[PDB]
């Protein structure tokens, strides 16, 4: 909600409280999304200052406060800063912003990140160009300098982050995106590559010196229909865990399909069906093995812009035979969401 707007500056404090439960057989250990309490809440702000007719400055911050922890020794698990960045937007010339923000492949993967709770299993966090990651300078331009209406593009330089864990490190790299949207339809692609830190090369899974991620999208988003598809592929960049050898690393190659179809009723119900498969190849010791393979059914009821409930069932098609130990049991989440 807009809490301040004087003298050209306007600050918007926002957040949500998400009452959420996950139901699955057994512990949820051999399950898709686990079993238990997953309640969380988010707080954030986005500011926008009108410097002049050509300038606008902006910043944004977003935090994940989990509500499924005790108040004891674990009260901080799953707490995280998601966003932290600032930038400017020049007339018909575009935008430049730096901080912690979204990888540019997510300009594509966002076509299929629409499920009530789950979504694009591929928009991993802290993973080069597919999701939110620390330290990206990003050039964005809307409507090609005011000439080609509907034509957008983005270039992003990704700084190195040599962290303690192989999974969260990344090397220096570059990436970009293009999107054309006309009269309800949308098509998009994006590509990125980056060095791999020496720690990433030391993991048993994943062999390569350069990580790569690209993805494509199609969508119809009009009347009350939303249909969307994403295809993308990756090299030495998706993280994997062989739950049998307790080994982590990266998948030498991955192939990802994402499909989402939903309809939005006037009275606030939004049914949703979706399919999502990500197949991995050349995993050392395994060869080929699926990582994500499921069908989604669910619905949201939108009481109004502030209150909503939903159910999300992931019919999990992974088998128990999975050579990486990817969980095979299904999972459903029930949720009630206040946001402001």
């Amino acid at each position: 909600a807009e809490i301040y707007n004087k003298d050209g500056n306007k600050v918007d404090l926002y957040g949500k409280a998400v009452g959420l439960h996950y139901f699955s057989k057994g512990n949820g250990e051999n399950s898709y999304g686990g079993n238990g309490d997953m309640t969380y809440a988010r707080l954030g702000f986005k500011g926008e200052t009108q410097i002049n007719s050509d300038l606008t400055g902006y910043g944004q911050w977003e935090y994940n406060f989990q509500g499924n922890n005790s108040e004891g020794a674990d009260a901080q698990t799953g707490n995280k800063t998601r966003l932290a960045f600032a930038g400017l937007k020049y007339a018909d010339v575009g935008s430049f912003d730096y901080g912690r923000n979204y990888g540019v492949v997510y300009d594509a993967l966002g076509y299929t990140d629409m499920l009530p709770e789950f979504g694009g299993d591929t928009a991993y966090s802290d993973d080069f160009f597919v999701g939110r990651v620390g330290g990206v300078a990003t050039y964005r331009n809307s409507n090609f300098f005011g000439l080609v209406d509907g034509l957008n593009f983005a270039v992003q330089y990704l700084g190195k982050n040599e962290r303690d864990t192989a999974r969260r490190s990344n090397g220096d790299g570059v990436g970009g995106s293009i999107s054309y949207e006309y009269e309800g339809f949308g098509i998009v692609g994006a590509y990125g590559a980056a060095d791999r830190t020496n720690l990433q090369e030391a993991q048993p899974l994943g062999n390569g010196k350069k990580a790569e991620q690209w993805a494509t999208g199609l969508k119809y988003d009009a009347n009350n229909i939303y249909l969307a598809a994403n295809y993308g592929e990756t090299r030495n960049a998706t993280p994997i865990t062989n739950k049998f050898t307790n080994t982590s690393g990266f998948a030498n190659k991955t192939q990802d399909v994402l499909l989402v179809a939903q309809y939005q009723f006037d009275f606030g119900l939004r049914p949703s069906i979706a399919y999502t498969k990500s197949k991995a190849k050349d995993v050392e010791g395994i060869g080929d093995v699926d990582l994500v393979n499921y069908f989604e059914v669910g619905a949201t009821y939108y009481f109004n812009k502030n209150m909503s409930t939903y159910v999300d069932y992931i019919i999990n098609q992974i088998d128990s035979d999975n050579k990486l130990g990817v969980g095979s049991d299904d999972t459903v989440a029930v949720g009630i969401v206040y946001q402001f």
Binding site: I51, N52, D54, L55, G87, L88, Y90, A91, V93, G94, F96, Y139
Partner: peptide
């Protein structure tokens, strides 16, 4: 810095 190495005249509109 904010103008992509020089392609943008940020200081000119500033």
């Amino acid at each position: 810095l904010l103008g992509m190495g020089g392609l943008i005249d940020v200081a000119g509109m500033a």
